[PDB]
Design a protein around this ligand. Structure first.
Ligand SMILES: Cc1ncc(COP(=O)(O)O)c(CNc2conc2O)c1O
Ligand SMILES: Cc1ncc(COP(=O)(O)O)c(CNc2conc2O)c1O
Lengths: 380, 382
């Protein structure tokens, strides 16, 4: 995959491999690892992250919705996949034909599905229980039993597992968390039989209490080397390795005279003669306008962004007359300077999770494995 | 093309067509229209909008960088395409064989290109002049004349046009706009001869001053039916037709008891008995966390978002019990209620341009033409 604009993201698969390996070491032998690769693996590349996680010790994969599971299958991934979110009862046959497990939490879903499907492939279901997140999941014992009854009755429906999700596993105070964990145990008792796969921990929960992860953990944010939250960082059992970095190059360089304005709205005025560099990245690439007033790295030095950020372009104040082609790092390291995704999330007034997901389809991803470029992916 | 999540965007190509067709009649008959379709047509679908615009009167297309132009050609587009942004002189040949025009703003670029290219396909260039935007473009007479001469010299280089871009055309006050217009006229005199295509007008400039557009306009934002700025809405010569809308469906419905928490951080807590719906759209789809105090349309009414927006979903307070599958409109109209891209932009404290561009690859685009679904585009579909 080649691309023709000097803007790209770099995904170090070694960082992903290591984050997964360290979790494997930490976790009891009986706890499996399910790599969470939804949203194109949090913007890092679904297949690339998936195959690497499987190498490091993960045996299963998780995605947000059916299409994401189908995209993995089409790309050659044959490992087990679980859709964490909702799906259509009408798509049960497709999921089954494609060996994709589905999350379920309503009895009417199963009834609708039973009327529309009768074989020949079995469908593996993971019952979602709401223990406090208030997102998806069954909440009454009567419903739980009805759902189980419908699955056991259908000759092609299988209850592979059951789970819940924690809403505050990344907060120092563990009051609500403990509440959710306790409620989960009580609800499990509603099941006539304990499914082979019981899981509940995400990155925060698994890393903090690896001994209360039952038989499978759903490793997400930490696999990409990003902390679940600022407050949990000083609690992480091992150093996370950031895998995502973002770069570009100066495509234009010019010296402005005092009084000259830059970008839309002419919001910036050069107070003194200075050199301005233009880079080929804008908000259509996920470098949102809110990043105005932020600093990028060039020649190992911080260079503030000047004026408003454009759809495809960006202007910065250079320390001096630098040549076109000079490497600009928006996320990553240059010399003794470093910009993390947390720094970017901070300025964007959001959390690390959102940043890589927002770097759009337009930005090619270059993959590094064993310190060598292994593959390049340009969505267009 | 199919998709398997109840979340999608609809692009009304009839609206696209009408916005461009109206511009066709507003402008002088000899003025060409270049449809700007960079960023996958501002998130509406590059080839679908490009093809539609050409039917409506547009004769040329514009993109941000080379990859977007090659994409259009791969998709069957044959009309002229100009790359507005920078490019690698090493890629000159490829662009030439693909009949893609390139923007140029410095002589050393031509030096490098000339050293690596010697035919057979001609490369058409559009010289960029910076008239106050401070992005790209030459700024002195010397450099200008040098670019022209280097183009003249090379047997396969051709100066097709010259242009500039306005930084404040969508502002009521026209002081800076006037300065830029006047500077552009001054800079045009630096050229030994006028290239066939002189241009400067974007949506705002073209719509407000159609008789000040030279021989070609670059129609962007208004083609999608979006006002260049809320400020000039009353100055619009003709009503724009909003092309983009975003929808979803409830995938779960439940009645919470007072005291129960919702979403990450246990941020929200129900005070009394209420109904909560869950929809399959989150920030990985472009529905940013920043929208947590915003709302959506359901059952023909405004339904506030509750708690924090997750990566793939969010919760909303329902007016009461509703069936799973009930349609939810994030951007569009339901009965006598409506949420526009401008509404989303205002809440997010950003401009309308950014909103559709942010609705990610993950969201399928359903295309309508002549009031019927024409095609579906699912970026991750089989
Ligand atoms: C059901 C489920 N399990 C595990 C994970 C992994 O969580 P982690 O990246 O903190 O390790 C997620 C993603 N959780 C989400 C984070 O933001 N929105 C989400 O849905 C999830 O939805
Ligand atoms: C050179 C050029 N011409 C024409 C247009 C169309 O502008 P319009 O959508 O206001 O009609 C743009 C896009 N203008 C941009 C808007 O944000 N960043 C941009 O580069 C552009 O960059």
């Amino acid at each position: 995959n080649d691309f023709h604009r000097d803007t790209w993201a770099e995904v170090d698969l070694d960082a992903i491999y290591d984050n997964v390996e360290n979790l494997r070491r930490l976790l009891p032998d009986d706890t499996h690892i399910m790599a969470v690769v939804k949203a194109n693996a949090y913007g890092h590349g679904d297949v690339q992250v998936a195959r690497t996680a499987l190498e490091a010790g993960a045996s299963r994969l998780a995605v947000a919705f059916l299409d994401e599971a189908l995209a993995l299958r089409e790309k050659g991934i044959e490992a087990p996949i679980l859709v964490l979110g909702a799906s259509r009862p009408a798509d049960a046959a497709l999921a089954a034909q494609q060996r994709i497990a589905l999350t379920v939490f309503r009895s009417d879903w199963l009834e609708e599905a039973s009327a529309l499907y009768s074989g020949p492939f079995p469908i593996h279901f993971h019952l979602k229980m709401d223990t406090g997140m208030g997102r998806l999941g069954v909440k009454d014992e009567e419903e739980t039993k009805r759902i189980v009854a419908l699955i056991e009755r259908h000759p092609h429906f299988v209850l592979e597992g059951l789970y819940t999700h924690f809403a505050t596993a990344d907060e120092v105070n563990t009051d609500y968390f403990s509440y959710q964990y306790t409620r989960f145990l009580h609800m499990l008792e509603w099941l006539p039989s304990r499914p082979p796969l019981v899981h509940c921990a995400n990155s925060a929960a698994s890393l903090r209490f690896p001994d209360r992860t039952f038989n499978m953990v759903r490793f997400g944010i930490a696999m990409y080397g990003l902390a679940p939250s600022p407050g949990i960082k000083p609690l992480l059992p091992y150093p996370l390795k950031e895998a995502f970095s973002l770069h570009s190059r100066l495509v234009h360089v010019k010296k402005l005279q005092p009084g000259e304005k830059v970008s839309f709205g002419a919001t910036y005025t050069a107070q003194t003669e200075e050199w301005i560099g233009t880079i080929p990245i804008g908000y259509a690439d996920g470098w949102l306008r809110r990043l105005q007033h932020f600093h990028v790295l060039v020649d190992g030095q911080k260079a503030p962004i000047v004026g408003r950020i454009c759809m495809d372009q960006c202007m910065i104040r250079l320390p001096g007359p630098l040549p076109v082609g000079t490497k600009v790092t928006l996320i990553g390291r240059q010399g003794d300077e470093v910009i993390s995704i947390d720094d970017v999330a901070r300025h964007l007034e959001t959390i690390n999770y959102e940043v890589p997901c927002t770097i759009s389809y337009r930005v090619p991803r270059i993959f590094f494995r064993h310190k060598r470029i292994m593959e390049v992916r340009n969505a267009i």
